[PDB]
Paper text:
The AAV viral protein 1 (VP1) N-terminus controls the capsid’s ability to translocate into the cell nucleus; however, the exact mechanism of this process is largely unknown. The classical nuclear import pathway involves the binding of cargo proteins to the host import receptor protein IMPα via a nuclear localization signal (NLS). An NLS is a short sequence of positively charged amino acids, comprising either one region, which interacts with one binding site of IMPα (monopartite NLS), or two regions, separated by a short “linker,” which interact concurrently with two binding sites of IMPα (bipartite NLS). Therefore, AAV6 VP1 is translocated into the nucleus by the IMPα/IMPβ heterodimer due to recognition of a bipartite NLS located in its N-terminus, thus following the classical nuclear import pathway.
Residue numbers in the entry:
A (entry chain A): 72 to 497
B (entry chain B): 122 to 126, 164 to 174
């Protein structure tokens, strides 16, 4: 019936003065834009159909044409920034916001989806959607006693659109908008649907990726314990955003890192640092490096949870990026830790993999490993055990690598290796 | 000393 229409026939039907003909043509356009192929979005735009679809969005007496046009415009807005721009320039944002209050659930869902695509284009269209007043009706759609009474796909689409309203930086979302949305996000974070939980954790990760004031806004809602709980989840789509959010949070103040620790996050890191997914492993090692950059009591908390052996493990065997995050974590540990903690670190066997990692090509990892070794040698100097550390670094064939690095192209590596070999290996 | 650093689809096409 409405399958495989030509854009010319679609235009013919839309330009008729027969609302039923227009509805048939609009459904034909929707189906044309719904194929698994890359839809013919450019052809639809060139025909000048966006304004007609936007007008059909306002026909409350013909809910089916509202639904078909909303679906078509959603698909159009799902494409390049230019096609989303074409949708927005047709005046579709206020029409979709008005349709958010439709009595029909599928029309409201399509409006939510379209607004989500528009906002996901970027921070400019996100802020424009917010300025047209979408947050209020969006959050009203979720003002129910129990989220379980909502359709699964409906709630998933609402959560995804809200996450896109929290997304993107330069600029970050308006502070008042973030504060208006956060409570609903916490509510959703206590939901049971894995996809809702994943999208909510991604929204929280977006909000926590910024200066310490954004982190503070997020942390004051008390979501850190729930984030740790989800960090212990089995489904990777949940663990990934939860770990990203925890990492963001620990990039802030020592008090925010302390909130992360008090929630019991470290107890989950034994598995995270041994996770089969290298991405989880790298994100966890980066979170650990940010934690070891904190206060001495926080380093001691890391020690008490038995995580130093896991840091040694990831330093010994892991993909190069994870090993680099581990080197950073060790350097922060040694720079901020007591000589007692550094001695413990050495006793766990850090020296051998730290040496092994000095044959790397990256000059940054080389210089950070040299900084770590320098901190370790200072700690040993305060103990009079510097000859012990020399014999340690020479037993595993490590001093050879420092001697080789003496001739590195980087001036900093050159000088650090020369200083180490001149003072501790002469 | 603390160093810094998107899986969900930014846009989704409705297939059905």
């Amino acid at each position: 019936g409405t399958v495989n229409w030509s854009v010319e026939d679609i235009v013919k039907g839309i330009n008729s003065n027969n609302l039923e003909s227009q509805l048939q043509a609009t459904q034909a356009a929707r189906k044309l834009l719904s194929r698994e192929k890359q839809p013919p979005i450019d052809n639809i735009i060139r025909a000048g159909l966006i304004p007609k679809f936007v007008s059909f969005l306002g026909k409350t007496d013909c809910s089916p044409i509202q639904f078909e046009s909303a679906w078509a415009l959603t698909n159009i807005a799902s494409g390049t920034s230019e096609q989303t721009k074409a949708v927005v320039d047709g005046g579709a944002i206020p029409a979709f916001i008005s349709l958010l209050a439709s009595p029909h659930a599928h029309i409201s869902e399509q409006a939510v989806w379209a607004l989500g695509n528009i906002a996901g284009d970027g921070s400019a269209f996100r802020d424009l959607v917010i300025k047209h007043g979408a947050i209020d009706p969006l959050l009203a759609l979720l003002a129910v006693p129990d989220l379980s009474t909502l359709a699964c796909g409906y709630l998933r689409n609402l959560t995804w659109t809200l996450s896109n309203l929290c997304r993107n930086k330069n600029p970050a979302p308006p502070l008042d908008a973030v504060e208006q949305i956060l409570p609903t996000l916490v509510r959703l974070l206590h939901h049971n649907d894995p996809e809702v939980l994943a999208d909510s954790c991604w929204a929280i990760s977006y909000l926590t990726d910024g200066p310490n004031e954004r982190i503070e806004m997020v942390v004051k809602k008390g979501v850190v314990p729930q984030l740790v709980k989800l960090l212990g989840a089995t489904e990777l789509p949940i663990v990934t955003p939860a770990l990203r959010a925890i990492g963001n949070i620990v990039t802030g103040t020592d008090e925010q890192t302390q909130k992360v620790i008090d929630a019991g996050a470290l107890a989950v890191f034994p598995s995270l640092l041994t996770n089969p997914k290298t991405n989880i492993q790298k994100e966890a090692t980066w979170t650990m490096s940010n934690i070891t950059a904190g206060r001495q009591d926080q380093i001691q908390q890391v020690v008490n949870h038995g995580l130093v052996p896991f840091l040694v493990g990831v330093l010994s065997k892991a993909d190069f990026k994870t090993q680099k995050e581990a080197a950073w974590a060790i350097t922060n540990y040694t720079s901020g830790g007591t000589v007692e903690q550094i001695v413990y670190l050495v006793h766990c066997g850090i020296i051998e993999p730290l040496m092994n990692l000095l044959s790397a090509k990256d000059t940054k990892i080389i210089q950070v490993i040299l900084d770590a070794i320098s901190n370790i040698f200072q700690a040993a100097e305060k103990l009079g055990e510097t000859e012990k550390l020399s014999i340690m670094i020479e037993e595993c064939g490590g001093l050879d690598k420092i001697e080789a690095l003496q001739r590195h192209e980087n001036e900093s590596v050159y000088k650090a290796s020369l200083n180490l070999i001149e003072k501790y290996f002469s | 000393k603390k160093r810094v650093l998107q899986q969900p689809a930014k846009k989704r096409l409705n297939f059905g």
